[PDB]
Symmetry: C3
Subunit: 635 residues, 3 copies
């Protein structure tokens, strides 16, 4: 075999996990939407791609969403000029599909499980309460003069009103631009100024991990260089005294108290911008295509059912919260989780106390969280029930098989489907993932593309498609899909240069990928992070997976630098578990052998640096420029 | 019987008036008896009433986009929804669709202050003038949702201003012509409107209203008003501020006579109407329009060729609903009466009916008591057979005035519909259907479609089930035309109507349901007087006083008394003919107190009676009892009362 | 016969031209939509007029355009108060019907044949390319804050992006106000200020006939007195260095490169204004959306017998209404190919039109009598040796086509195998009002023939105001009822709208033209009523006399006007241009003026002979092509000259008359 799966301590033949009992409609669990085998996935997937897929997408579009005006055309446009259209003649409102229609059917159903930073302060937020709070905010924005198409920045932590802020903008046709509450005043400034918003929504302070986020302090600093912000809505989250600029700044509760608890929905066109999410690339998503994509993926990738309680542990400052905390779940009318704390506050058992308390049916987090909890021991999880869960999802980066097994062993008790969901902020929704009721998973493989995704592997040098299996290269998409980002706000040139120009005719994700002998897709990491040693292209996940196979390795990050013998050299930055006593033990040799043993001599790191902890909310570009979190520069 | 009807000189058994011949079978919409009213009413309330309202909504109004949901929300948080997904335009349903069917049909009977200047305004003429004004507003930058203040007298173009705002999706805020510069100021500043429509001068009762003069004074303290449209009503020279002020006729001559209709959502605000801080009551589009359309059709048994005469002003909700939106929504002829009931003489109302053959008349007890005060010579020698229904609104109509209305104006051949409602209800809430309900003088009778009201004991706070009960009036469920909020003050909206009795809407009136199920509105809860644990209503005492020969108008209030808790103080106005020099003032006040003792009881006898020439009232006609209460309590037409009491 | 056709050298009996074979569905040409005879035109026309025509218009409205929301009422309003309504409850978007729906069907089909001033720089613009550029400009306009209902002035030459600028404004619901590229800074200034636009679209420089149009220079001068214009979008047409005002002025390409290539369509109501077109105070003619779009679509389809694969070539400019209706909206609404001709008829040579036809296989041609008379003045070498068989229909617009020029058109341009459609209408009619349907009507040189669908026209005595029933009658032209494409107002001046067209003859629309209906029912437009000359109580029309003069060998173009005469009331004065080869030295001018005056006396009558004739090199004309007779009238007797093409001619005329 030319394509090698990610290094795992378990042999290959023992590493195929079929849909487990809970995903078979047994043990009181509902029937999956797609099952029972791979063939059932292909039967349905084949309808969503190719020349006869307008019928399927038109039906799913009209069955999944409530429309004000029906659409005539299904799709149009393409990558070349960035004019992708989906259901253009149709009109709808995202807030209507995520709130109103569910409020009209069951007003008392819980929409949001607000898991506060402190476990006792948690509570359920019904669709009625959330709709009221959203219409109040919408009415406040309209009183500030926010019109259809105006940008509104959101700088809110993971409190339940953050969904009301999002949907308040969507309800009136405003483009919300969410900014993670941990971002600095300098980062916020850049995003508030780029979107040219005139209104900003934020908190007095945020609460995460028992520590205070000085949000209103961070806003006041940024706004000194944001001349366009005239109105700032401040939610009273902590109540601590914060500066309030008279005239500009108003309190959420006081403003909403003046407005009615209903607000009419603006009739939006499918291609009206729904939100900007800065990554700075202000990635722009439309309404219908994005909403439909997030709705379908949640239903099928997480096998969501009406009475399910979906728990996505991301932040609404990232696309994961946009798609799989707010728009996706609420569009399907189920319960979604707004988790305000960290995975290790008050203790590393928080995720599991949370599931058992609410009987969560699915969990969705990142490899960074999984590897963190793995470094903290199985005592915080071994003594839990967790039988409510049926599907466990991972997103953000390649999940090392060791973490995948840790995930499957303890969190799922070997009875949950593990969905490795690959996608980007620009894809809008999950692009490659196993349907839990049909796909047998391989640790660290996103498996097969989702409905509407037709992806190929291309040789980056020649630009030629590699037909068949056992191939490796860069990942691309053949055709647009509904939830694809439509542009980069006021920088369409950068939108085309980044995703459409490198390989004309396709969408360029920026990831190296490989399709193994069985057809499973393997995402190996960013193309920029690849290392070419003696003409052999090493992927970042391949080497890092081997290092964590060594007992005591907690997290790694390999980067390259030009070597005067091999072209490029592998340099490693390794974090050890807290128990590995580096005073008694002199290790860097045992790790390099681990690479030489599992990968090959060419992959052996030329130098290894043992470090205590750069990451986002892993910055390998930082590690590259250093060799070419100040401890890294010192070590 | 525990619940007592309003004192009447006619004994009870002789005081039930069945639907008279004119309201008998062409055919009324609901008839011929009470059961015919209940069979239909039952469809409009309860858990199975969506079918009826969905049908009525789609049959009564033209929609751009149909609605999916019928109703949602409730009182608790003030999120009432009706037909939310639907879209429509008020101007389209009041003008366009009728212009398309019969453009030459008369929409407005403009009865000018001088009878000779009257004329008919067709739907074509009204629609053109409405599109012209709408085109002017759009040229000023008025967008959907922007507030526009209207300060116009009772000239027919006032309907054009209303519907012009509704046509483009602007929220008009009408202010009664004659309010001071200060009252206007507060309403213009609260709604934050950037455009104001008014006249050069108004004409009412042979007197000139200096509207533009009052506007210029107010705008000195209204910084947001950039454009003022001035209608040339009299032509007398008035100041015009360059840039800000433009002439109605000159502006409209630049614009086309058609304007596209803004596609409004059911719950988009239609107008703000401030009540005498100033409470800006807000009404939506679909629910309000439907309510005013249905009530007009069923409460006044309106048919296509009728000529509806509501003698109110467009500055009050009565003019909003039953001069403009209600009648014109049904596509009939409506009256814009610019004069007073007594100009040139007290025969004006009746000269008006016979001139135009009015089929219904709608006015207030304050006007009825006025004509009663002016003698029956001005009405006895008129025909008035065109009328089928006579309506009363604003406050309880004493049975003494009810009979005068019934005897002379209707010649005992018209149904008398006592219509109870408020600005916040949008449309008539309790009233007898004239083709089905037998009336009692001073009784609103039974609730309208969509209104399910109960009596609640204010002490216990519990609903009193059954008949022969008395308490405070409340509604069980929202209805389409209910006000949606108070402009930029939703808290005051909830605290005033929804929080006092959670789960219900609190009107603010004491009411009683007699042994037959008839509802009796006895006056404001604030006006109730607690004498030794007995709650006296203002209607009970004032009705007894006007029964005494010579009494023109009365108003009783309460004040802190030691032995009985509160004491009843009376302010009585005598007819101008009453020789108060020949009769002793003490002898008269004694006969009045005994009159109260005879029909109500000893506890109701006024501790002191004050003979005054006139009582302080608002411009809508309501009597200002709060003022009389604070004056008697020593907490300093108002200079005469404070001086006489001393 | 009382009504006389325009003087023609061909006798009458030899002057009836039936639909030729190319218009009969033979030779493989498509079948006409209406044919084959007059009875077939009236059969369909009668459905479009009177009180029983709502069914037809509702069906055509729903068959011709894609609607977001359907309409309930078909028509309402009238002339009296200027409240004309058509399909009011309906909603649609012009850009959607001219671009989107055609992009969705065949994105690679050519929408615009861009014939640049230089033939080599020409190319085809697909519906995909035009839609993308239109959505980009719309997105730029939205980024400038342009809202539904805002005016946007366009000062663009005849480059294909002018269609993108138009449709970008319509796409977002903006009212574009086009001004012909070449108007002075003063004419532009007055039009930018009247529409109160805050955005202006223009080029750095224009190119027409090998000459440079200093568009940005004229814009910079005009905007010095236009305080409301905050943003100027400048298209890079030539690339020559032009002044750019920092902040205000931005480059089309740089701005569009920042925006996506798709933009949602604004849902416009039928009666929302689509554009303002000022005519030479400035008269801002306003057109609505649905009715205008329907009219331009139907007229193009039926007056030019347009079929899906046709290549329509309207040689006008988007600065006047002919380009609005029969370069952009009409053709693109039908989803066919249209031509953006940037040059002149004689650049590089007078063979350009014909090089153009054979180059692109144009299926129809649409130009003005001034262009036809120009090419006739330049000799048959430039046209005789061309194929031109792609053509099936040849159109004339702007003024009466003299029978002499009509024959030249029919003989050389059509090689006696094309239908000649003389299309009468005004900027205020929106679309062609009177014209022969080429597959059904047999034509007479210089006759607009019969009214188009929705047009019911009468002849009225201008003095008595009475309708002249029947045939062989003469008077002034009026319309009985509103039609879909009729102008709805004059921008912010509805008073001038009513006083000009609705008040003169209450109950009708007053075109301002003298007309006559001959014994056969054919309509004859005789010229402006203002241009009529009263000689001894005889009402002379400008078309009959000018047609008579051009019958004289050597005459290129003429223009007669009226003047105060002390004996006959008014006297006929003539301005005649001879072909360049005509030796005015060998032939005596006084002898020519005698032969011309006799030519007029022989065909018309003694009263029609010009009292004085002036030989001039050219005439004062506008860019639309109609001769400015008011200028010649006021000069002869001893003010709205914005469209004056060559102001130099007025100085030669003022010298040659004094
Ligand atoms: N399952 C996965 N397996 C391997 N790589 C993965 C996987 N999910 C994400 N990635 C990497 O994340 C980038 C995009 O991240 P971003 O769009 O910034 O954040 C978004 C990403 C999804 C939610 C937050 C991809 O281009 C990849 O490199
Ligand atoms: N038929 C009636 N019988 C007894 N009382 C009545 C009756 N009609 C009104 N009222 C009192 O008027 C208030 C409302 O006043 P307002 O807000 O001006 O509403 C407008 C609505 C029409 C004119 C007043 C009620 O709440 C009552 O107190
Ligand atoms: N076929 C024709 N036969 C005789 N006269 C005609 C003909 N077409 C136009 N006209 C005269 O042009 C005026 C309108 O000019 P304009 O407003 O520019 O409209 C534009 C619309 C087309 C180009 C001019 C008419 O009122 C007439 O006088």
């Amino acid at each position: 075999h030319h394509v090698h799966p990610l290094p795992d301590s378990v042999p290959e033949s023992e590493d195929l996990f079929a849909p487990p009992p809970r995903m078979q409609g047994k043990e009181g669990r509902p029937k999956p939407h797609i099952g029972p085998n791979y063939e059932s996935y292909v039967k349905e997937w084949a309808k969503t791609v190719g020349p006869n897929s307008d019928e399927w997408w038109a039906a799913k579009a009209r069955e999944t969403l409530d429309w004000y005006d029906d659409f005539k055309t299904v799709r149009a446009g393409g990558f070349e000029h960035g004019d992708v259209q989906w259901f253009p003649e149709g009109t709808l409102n995202a807030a209507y599909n995520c709130l109103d229609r569910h409020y009209y059917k069951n007003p008392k159903k819980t929409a949001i499980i607000y898991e506060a930073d402190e476990p006792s302060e948690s509570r359920e937020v019904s669709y009625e309460e959330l709709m009221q709070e959203t219409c109040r905010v919408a009415n406040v924005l309209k009183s500030y003069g926010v019109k259809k198409g105006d940008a509104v920045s959101i700088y809110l932590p993971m409190t339940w009103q953050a969904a009301a802020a999002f949907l308040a903008c969507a309800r009136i046709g405003a483009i919300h631009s969410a900014v993670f509450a941990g971002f600095s005043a300098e980062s916020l400034r850049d995003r508030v100024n780029d979107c040219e918003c005139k209104v900003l929504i934020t908190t007095d302070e945020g609460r995460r991990g028992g520590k205070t986020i000085a949000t209103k302090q961070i806003v006041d600093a940024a706004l000194q260089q944001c001349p366009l912000v005239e109105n700032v809505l401040v939610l009273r989250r902590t109540g601590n005294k914060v500066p309030m600029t008279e005239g500009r700044d108003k309190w959420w509760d006081e403003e909403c108290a003046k407005m009615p608890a209903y607000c009419p929905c603006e009739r939006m066109a499918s291609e009206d911008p729904l939100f900007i999410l800065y990554t700075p690339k202000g990635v722009v998503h439309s309404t219908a295509g994005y909403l439909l994509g997030t709705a379908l993926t949640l239903k099928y990738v997480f096998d969501a059912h009406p009475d399910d309680r979906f728990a996505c542990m991301a932040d609404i400052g990232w696309i994961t919260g946009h798609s799989y905390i707010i728009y996706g779940p609420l569009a399907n009318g189920i319960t979604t989780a707004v988790f305000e704390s960290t995975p290790v506050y008050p203790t590393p058992s928080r995720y599991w106390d949370f599931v058992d308390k609410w009987k969560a049916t699915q969990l969705y987090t990142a490899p960074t969280a999984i590897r963190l909890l793995r470094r903290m021991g199985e005592d915080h999880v071994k003594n839990h029930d967790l039988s409510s869960l049926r599907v466990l999802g991972s997103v953000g980066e390649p999940i090392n098989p060791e973490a995948w097994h840790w995930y499957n062993d303890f969190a799922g008790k070997n009875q949950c489907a593990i969905v490795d969901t690959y996608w980007m902020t620009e894809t809008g929704s999950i692009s490659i993932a196993p349907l839990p009721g049909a796909i047998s998973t391989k640790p660290g493989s996103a498996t097969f593309p989702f409905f509407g995704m037709d992806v190929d592997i291309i040789d980056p040098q020649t630009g030629q498609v590699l037909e068949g299996n056992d191939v490796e290269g860069v990942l691309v998409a053949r055709r647009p899909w509904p939830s694809i980002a439509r542009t980069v706000y006021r920088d369409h040139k950068r939108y085309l240069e980044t995703y459409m120009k490198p390989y004309p005719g396709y969408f360029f994700f920026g990831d190296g990928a490989a399709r193994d002998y069985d057809g499973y897709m393997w995402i190996k990491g960013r193309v920029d992070d690849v290392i070419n040693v003696s003409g052999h292209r090493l992927s970042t996940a391949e080497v890092e997976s081997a290092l964590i196979l060594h007992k005591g390795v907690a997290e790694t990050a390999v980067v390259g630098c030009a070597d005067d013998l091999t072209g490029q050299a592998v340099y490693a930055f390794v974090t050890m578990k807290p128990e590995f006593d580096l005073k008694a033990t002199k290790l860097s040799k045992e790790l390099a052998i681990q690479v030489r043993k599992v990968i090959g001599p060419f992959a052996a790191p030329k130098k290894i640096y043992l470090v205590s902890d750069p990451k986002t909310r892993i910055m390998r570009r930082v590690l590259r420029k250093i060799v070419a979190v100040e401890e890294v520069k010192q070590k």
